[PDB]
Symmetry: D2
Amino acid sequence: LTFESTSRFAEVDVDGPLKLHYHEAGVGNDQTVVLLHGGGPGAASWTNFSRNIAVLARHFHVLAVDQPGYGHSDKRAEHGQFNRYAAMALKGLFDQLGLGRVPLVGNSLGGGTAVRFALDYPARAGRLVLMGPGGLSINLFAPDPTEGVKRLSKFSVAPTRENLEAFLRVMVYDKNLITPELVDQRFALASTPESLTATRAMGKSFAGADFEAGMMWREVYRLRQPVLLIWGREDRVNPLDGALVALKTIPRAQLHVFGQCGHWVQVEKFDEFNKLTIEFLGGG
Amino acid sequence: LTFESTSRFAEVDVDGPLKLHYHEAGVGNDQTVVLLHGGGPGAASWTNFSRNIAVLARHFHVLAVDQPGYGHSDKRAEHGQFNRYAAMALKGLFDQLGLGRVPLVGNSLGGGTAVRFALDYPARAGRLVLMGPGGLSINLFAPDPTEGVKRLSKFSVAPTRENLEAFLRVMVYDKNLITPELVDQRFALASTPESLTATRAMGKSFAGADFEAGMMWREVYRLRQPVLLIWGREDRVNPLDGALVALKTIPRAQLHVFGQCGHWVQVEKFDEFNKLTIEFLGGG
Amino acid sequence: LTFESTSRFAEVDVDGPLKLHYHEAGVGNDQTVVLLHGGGPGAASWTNFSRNIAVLARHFHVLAVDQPGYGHSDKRAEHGQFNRYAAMALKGLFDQLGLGRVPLVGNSLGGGTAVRFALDYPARAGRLVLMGPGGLSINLFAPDPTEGVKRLSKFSVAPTRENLEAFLRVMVYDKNLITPELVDQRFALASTPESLTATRAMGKSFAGADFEAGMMWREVYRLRQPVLLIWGREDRVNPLDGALVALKTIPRAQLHVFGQCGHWVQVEKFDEFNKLTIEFLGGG
Amino acid sequence: LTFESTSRFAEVDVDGPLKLHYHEAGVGNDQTVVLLHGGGPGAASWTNFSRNIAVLARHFHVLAVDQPGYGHSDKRAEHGQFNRYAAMALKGLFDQLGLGRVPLVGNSLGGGTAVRFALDYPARAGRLVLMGPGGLSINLFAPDPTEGVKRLSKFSVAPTRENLEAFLRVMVYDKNLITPELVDQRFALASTPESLTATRAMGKSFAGADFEAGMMWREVYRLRQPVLLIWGREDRVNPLDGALVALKTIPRAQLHVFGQCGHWVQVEKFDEFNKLTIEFLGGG
């Protein structure tokens, strides 16, 4: 399996034509699962889920979607509440590919998008796996913005290699995962004017009149499906106190917490996450 | 596998001879695991772990021990801090069977015993799996005693079938698990004068000068092994707020929480618990 | 100051005529404050707050209102979501008495009423003091229903003296404040057939399709005034973990917790409660 | 009242002569109270509490002690666990001045000192007021080190004006209280080479084999006096989740949280803090 062999585009109508890049793998398998990546500068599906797609594709028909503003998907300068916008695009894509009810796996921003999809198109989302997700998280103890969110903001105002490395280093518990190569790859994608356009837009997108659509912790008591929340204990972007409203109010919630793990569970605990996800979504 | 085929006794010296009943299964398998049951009136290994022993014995050499005061183990009228007393007996048993370093799985009182064993005989305990455990739990929000602990106390003062059924019903989320048969079986064992002797003794045992040995949440920062905490979200004996000090202070802690699950995870979520335990202890 | 000397009535319109009973004291004091009692059986303004009123009336013009269904207020057999019903009744009373913007003090159900009033009529609510309040409380760790709520439901199905006693005993840390007289007084008021119809009416309302208006933890991020949350550490009805969402999301929140105090803060910490309320509402 | 008019010195014995500087005010007031400042760079009694002292001295005989390593107290290059070292120093001062049992008010490091003093010399500590205290705080949800602790360590490795400014900005909610003057004042006191040796000494002590004496969350169940915990909701050094163990396990605890307040409660909520302290220590 490669970036190139798995690569696909579709066009959907979200207030006009919108190009979506996605990867597709395990076309043999009956059970489709959609993967939505995290929302850090230069993130995309292939790199966010590089320790996961090969393993999951042995069990499931994998659709790993570059959310609008990321990877090879369109990067408009203007859009409404990000997770609602990404959810509309994904819904466009589900209609185009003929999908009915499909489980979703989402990290950080992608977990926000998964939850917003599942609330707006309730019959279309099956079981959710959400790792350190935004939107349904409300940090009952951590003063906002968190150290992770501050570093992301500092990069958007001053997009240097140094500010990106400082942001990546609060993503993980073990700093040695943030290798000179990783930083070079992410910085190369993040620093394009198209990406910085997207990165700005996404910032503004959260502080408007539809901020209510970002407070998904008010709405997840309505989710009827099983939902696996996965968190690193040392997550410094969306800390662990942000799991508590969702775990209480989602009737069929489960929570797994990993000690010695930051915001990137799917990377730092890839094997345990792969096995939780495979088991939770039914072995395929 | 049966109660009778698996049954074993040993004698160990804990301030004088002490008869221990245990079950042994999967004698073919290299990896030994010890199972310690919960501490409710009439609990014993075989019934506490009846949805678990057969599955676990396919992977591991299972030693499911009736703690002192329970099952077919001696029921002395007098003993010190219960978990320390049960830990000394288990340590006696490890020396007798030639065990070195062995993983432990423990529910409620049994989790207390596992943790006290792991602190007092640190080189002798491998990975721990603890479900709704006593001792390391400190209920930061729930006023003590909890509804579960009150019902256990009311039974010890007035040991009727009605008080036992009221206690069993706050053990589980789904009340239909508390069948007329289950109540009859547990009540028959719980109501013997030997058992009520044990049940009284165990009460007194916690409120002495060595109450510090029961506050294991002060000492688990010293545990060096991986530790899987498993909780039901609706546990009304040792509520979920009681997981927080252990999850924070145990360096290699993990936490799994099941929605729609009470104090008896190994029963109400038997399949998910069996698979967590098998995976966490290395597949065997 | 007596029940009779302070006793007042006003007729307001909520789907027709509605008789409201209230107590008035400290007439001529510059600052008016409205007290709203809790939802326990036979609860009323004068029994809930009798001692606190004499003290607050030294500083404030106190209006202590019997909520619809309680004390000498109308006890209809049916109504919508209680807190919006009680808040409309209260709005009627504010309009009739020409009250502008007034601080509100509420215990349990009355705290929810105060909050629903402060969200629906924002310009009419001043500073809020909420003791162990309903509606904006969401027990993130305590399984629902709590011990206190279960003993309230039990009384409501089997309205005996002995079930009322069981309920009152989990309102307080010091069970000696539950005198044979207090039981007799409250049993007398709770067991009249109109009060019984008012508690059967309360049943259907909280269990009915207008439940979202009860979930004010979703809404209190709109409150613009200072809010003082007051909690007994040992509250067994609305436990301390229910404070966390309101404390996080109300911009100008404060929380005060008293050790060795149940749900009835205004009784068990009488002095410290009066002094907090007086200082927080401005000394008068 | 001035630095010079209130300034006092006393020589006490802790592994030899130790010069302690303190401030005294409100001489002749019946009730003595000891204030203990925080551990930030260039922290001292008079800078930490200057405004609060004038107010508390209207009611109390105030002794505001510079802890060893700070202000004008001796700045040794080495010592044991700081809080037991500072508490022994304090015991020396209480013995020299013939103080019996005295209430203590402590911020951050000084709160830990107050607690260690109250556990080791139980008959000499009265009521405690602890603002965002160290030692008895255990951040159950915040990964350690916190943002505040990291900026303190950074200053300590690279003692520039700009690193001190970064530290002070995460002490407060309103970053405008961090004046160019405050920076200049604190940089002046923090950057003297003896203060530098005192912070390098502080390093080795907290990171050394005497760390268990620092973990007072394990011990505060022994405190028999009333304890008032005071917290800024937005505390980025010792965040609000660190209050929970002390609030649960101190029998006569109270907690007060202020919204829109950082770690420096005594500055950012000056009035409400003075009034709580005055009321709680008995009005004087």
